Amino acid sequence: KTVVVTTILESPYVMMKKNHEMLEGNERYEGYCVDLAAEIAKHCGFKYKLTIVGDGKYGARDADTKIWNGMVGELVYGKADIAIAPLTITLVREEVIDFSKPFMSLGISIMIKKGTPIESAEDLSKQTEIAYGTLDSGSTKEFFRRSKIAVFDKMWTYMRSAEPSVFVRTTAEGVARVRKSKGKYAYLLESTMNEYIEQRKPCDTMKVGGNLDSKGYGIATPKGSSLGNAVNLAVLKLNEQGLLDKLKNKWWYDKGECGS
Amino acid sequence: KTVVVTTILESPYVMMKKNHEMLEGNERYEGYCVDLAAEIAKHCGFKYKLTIVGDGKYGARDADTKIWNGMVGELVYGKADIAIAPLTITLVREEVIDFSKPFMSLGISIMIKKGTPIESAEDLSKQTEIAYGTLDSGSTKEFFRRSKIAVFDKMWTYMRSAEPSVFVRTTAEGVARVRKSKGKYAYLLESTMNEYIEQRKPCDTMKVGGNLDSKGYGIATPKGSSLGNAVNLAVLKLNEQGLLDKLKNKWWYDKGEC
Numbered sequence: 001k002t003v004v005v006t007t008i009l010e011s012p013y014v015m016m017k018k019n020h021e022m023l024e025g026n027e028r029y030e031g032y033c034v035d036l037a038a039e040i041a042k043h044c045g046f047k048y049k050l051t052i053v054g055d056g057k058y059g060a061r062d063a064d065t066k067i068w069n070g071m072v073g074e075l076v077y078g079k080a081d082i083a084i085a086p087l088t089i090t091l092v093r094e095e096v097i098d099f100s101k102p103f104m105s106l107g108i109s110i111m112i113k114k115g116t117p118i119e120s121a122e123d124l125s126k127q128t129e130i131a132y133g134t135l136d137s138g139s140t141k142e143f144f145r146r147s148k149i150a151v152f153d154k155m156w157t158y159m160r161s162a163e164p165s166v167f168v169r170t171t172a173e174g175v176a177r178v179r180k181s182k183g184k185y186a187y188l189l190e191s192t193m194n195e196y197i198e199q200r201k202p203c204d205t206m207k208v209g210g211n212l213d214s215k216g217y218g219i220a221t222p223k224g225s226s227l228g229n230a231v232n233l234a235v236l237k238l239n240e241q242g243l244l245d246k247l248k249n250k251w252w253y254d255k256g257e258c259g260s
Numbered sequence: 261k262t263v264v265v266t267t268i269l270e271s272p273y274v275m276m277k278k279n280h281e282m283l284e285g286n287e288r289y290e291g292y293c294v295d296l297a298a299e300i301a302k303h304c305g306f307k308y309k310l311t312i313v314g315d316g317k318y319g320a321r322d323a324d325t326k327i328w329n330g331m332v333g334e335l336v337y338g339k340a341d342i343a344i345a346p347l348t349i350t351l352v353r354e355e356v357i358d359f360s361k362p363f364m365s366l367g368i369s370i371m372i373k374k375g376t377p378i379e380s381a382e383d384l385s386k387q388t389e390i391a392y393g394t395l396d397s398g399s400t401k402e403f404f405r406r407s408k409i410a411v412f413d414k415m416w417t418y419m420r421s422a423e424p425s426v427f428v429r430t431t432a433e434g435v436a437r438v439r440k441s442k443g444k445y446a447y448l449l450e451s452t453m454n455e456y457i458e459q460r461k462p463c464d465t466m467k468v469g470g471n472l473d474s475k476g477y478g479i480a481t482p483k484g485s486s487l488g489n490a491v492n493l494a495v496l497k498l499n500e501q502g503l504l505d506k507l508k509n510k511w512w513y514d515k516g517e518c
């Protein structure tokens with residue numbers, strides 16, 4: 001049987017090829033998660049079809065209806081066999097689906113326009129001349145909203161009350177705001193995306209300081225799925241063989257536009 | 261029934277307190293994994309006893325007898341219920357015990373005596389005047405044994421054929437060998453331990469180069485153990501609450517003695 005893989009279009013994980021109209025099936029797509037899916041399938045011995053999650057979401061449980069959306073929902077309700085995507089291992093997701101050990105690490109990080117005089121979260125928190133914010137929804141805003149840590153609590157109070165709004169609707173809007181604000185806006189986002197954008201023309205942004213937290217992306221399967229064991233062993237093997245490091249270097253740096 | 265926790269004396273994870281003979285039970289010990297054990301037990305609602313691994317090893321399988329030693333062995337053969345320790349999640353271990361998602365990241369790294377003219381693994385691999393090795397019965401030695409990455413493969417061939425032996429039985433032995441060999445021994449050990457030691461007296465060692473790999477430590481249980489689910493959920497909760505980061509900052513805090 002062909003294994004149904006649910007994933008999401010986000011660069012550089014999964015992208016439609018420029019010439020996709022001339023291609024078929026899995027060959028329409030490229031990226032880190034496309035390469036990872038092929039390696040997993042080869043090690044586990046299965047054929048697969050890449051499908052893009054209908055609602056474009058990662059996975060959260062609606063407060064009112066209690067229905068899981070996104071890739072997580074596709075697994076929970078039995079519509080897909082596996083999710084191969086930048087999907088973070090979190091407590092509430094682990095309660096409803098199985099996860100491999102993580103294939104990539106990340107944490108919340110600061111993006112500045114080059115030249116901005118900020119080196120750390122502590123620096124941002126202690127000032128207001130350089131405004132700073134997050135996506136208007138999702139996991140990074142939630143991190144600050146929920147934090148009991150003093151520095152991050154202070155940052156949340158500032159962001160929630162800052163005018164005009166320091167929040168943005170999309171990643172692209174956050175990046176454009178950093179680039180157009182003459183050093184007066186810093187954007188808080190996942191370190192993996194920050195690193196990727198640091199390698200996009202016009203090469204005017206950079207990641208600064210240590211990460212604010214630590215977490216990992218994992219491959220997800222329905223709870224109790226037999227496929228989960230083999231997939232987890234494959235991730236651990238690909239890590240030890242150095243293949244995951246090779247794939248991150250390929251998509252972030254070999255294909256990067258801003259030099260070393 | 262009281263849960264039997266196996267762990268290992270390795271700074272700053274588990275250390276015997278200076279006045280331990282005046283203390284009783286779990287209070288004899290301090291460190292990151294001692295604090296983590298307390299937190300896991302509280303979230304999971306069990307009572308527990310910290311016990312130090314009988315043979316002083318992390319855990320590997322004998323290639324001839326196929327018997328596991330160290331903390332891994334204590335779980336496999338039923339001598340302990342759980343390991344709370346800097347125990348690295350690896351493929352060969354995952355096949356025989358259960359692991360939580362990782363509670364801490366690390367990578368293999370190089371420790372030298374100050375002044376040693378080595379800056380990278382590639383530098384080590386290209387010479388023999390400065391000997392280099394690692395710990396027996398752990399994940400670092402297994403990593404070199406199995407690696408086909410050119411530089412690491414060459415390092416393993418060197419280590420296997422070096423005379424006298426470049427391997428050590430405990431982390432403490434490896435560190436003492438660096439300190440006493442006048443620049444002629446380098447030690448391959450995890451970045452977490454390397455960085456803790458660099459910040460403390462006698463201030464005569466240092467970490468050089470980037471890490472060779474990236475991996476994590478996990479809480480381990482016998483395969484199929486019912487305690488596994490709850491412990492894994494507690495690790496994720498403690499991560500999300502910021503508690504793991506709090507413990508890391510506490511135990512790796514730089515007092516500035518170096």
Ligand SMILES: N[C@@H](CCC(=O)O)C(=O)O
Pocket residue numbers: 318319346347348395397398399400401448449450
């Ligand atoms: N943490 C390692 C021990 C140290 C090492 O081998 O470098 C293990 O679980 O075996």
Ligand SMILES: [Cl-]
Pocket residue numbers: 198203258
């Ligand atoms: Cl750059």
